[PDB]
Ligand binder design. Structure first.
Ligand SMILES: CC1=CC(=O)CC(C)(C)[C@@]1(O)/C=C/C(C)=C\C(=O)O
Length: 193
């Protein structure tokens, strides 16, 4: 039947076992899902050499995903947009012709614990029931500071497609965007001001 995910029981690539052991409780709390046989799920991680709040400032900007995501032609939130749970954005994604479109709902926004997440609720694409959660975590060792970003998703595997291809597609999109997040925020952190 329906199973529970095991992301919180395995070390994701781009993370040390030591980092994982510090995060296992957060991964269980924020990055676990009950999924059905038609579904798949994944957890991705990205180490960033920047302070938490520098990374969180970018991560939390629901109305501006283009700041850290690839292939975003536009993101409209209308007027008068306030950042509250339930608010939506219309993203236009230029990774093909015609451009894919996605209407996405802000599911979570916790500025204290640095948790956010969204659900895809419309548009033209093949990621039915896509939902993701992103958490941001600070690390310290001998006065040195860095950040780990964790991002997990659940999504329906579209008819005609394998779970492997579905996971490869979504994993690559999320991974490459976490890479852009790392570049953008490390640049911010490096230049300060
Ligand atoms: C890049 C792109 C191609 C598609 O066909 C679907 C969709 C338009 C939703 C998407 O924006 C996918 C976005 C994903 C998986 C994650 C995200 O944005 O956090």
């Amino acid at each position: 039947l329906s199973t529970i995910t095991t992301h919180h029981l395995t070390v994701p690539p781009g993370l040390t076992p030591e980092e994982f052991q510090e995060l296992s409780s957060s991964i269980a709390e924020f990055h676990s899902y009950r999924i059905n046989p038609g579904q798949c799920s994944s957890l991705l991680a990205q180490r960033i050499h920047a302070p938490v709040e520098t990374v969180w400032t970018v991560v939390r900007r629901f109305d501006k995903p283009q700041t850290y995501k690839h292939f975003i032609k536009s993101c409209s939130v209308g007027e008068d947009f306030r950042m509250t749970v339930g608010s939506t954005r219309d993203v236009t994604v230029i990774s093909g012709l015609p451009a894919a479109t996605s209407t996405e709902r802000l599911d979570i926004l916790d500025d204290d614990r640095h948790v956010t997440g969204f659900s895809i609720i419309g548009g033209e694409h093949r990621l039915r029931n896509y939902r993701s959660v992103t958490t941001v975590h600070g690390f310290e060792r001998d006065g040195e500071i860095w950040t780990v970003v964790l991002e997990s998703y659940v999504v329906d595997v579209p008819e005609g497609n394998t779970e492997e291809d579905t996971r490869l597609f979504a994993d690559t999109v999320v991974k490459l965007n976490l890479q852009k997040l790392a570049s953008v925020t490390e640049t911010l952190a490096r230049e300060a001001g």
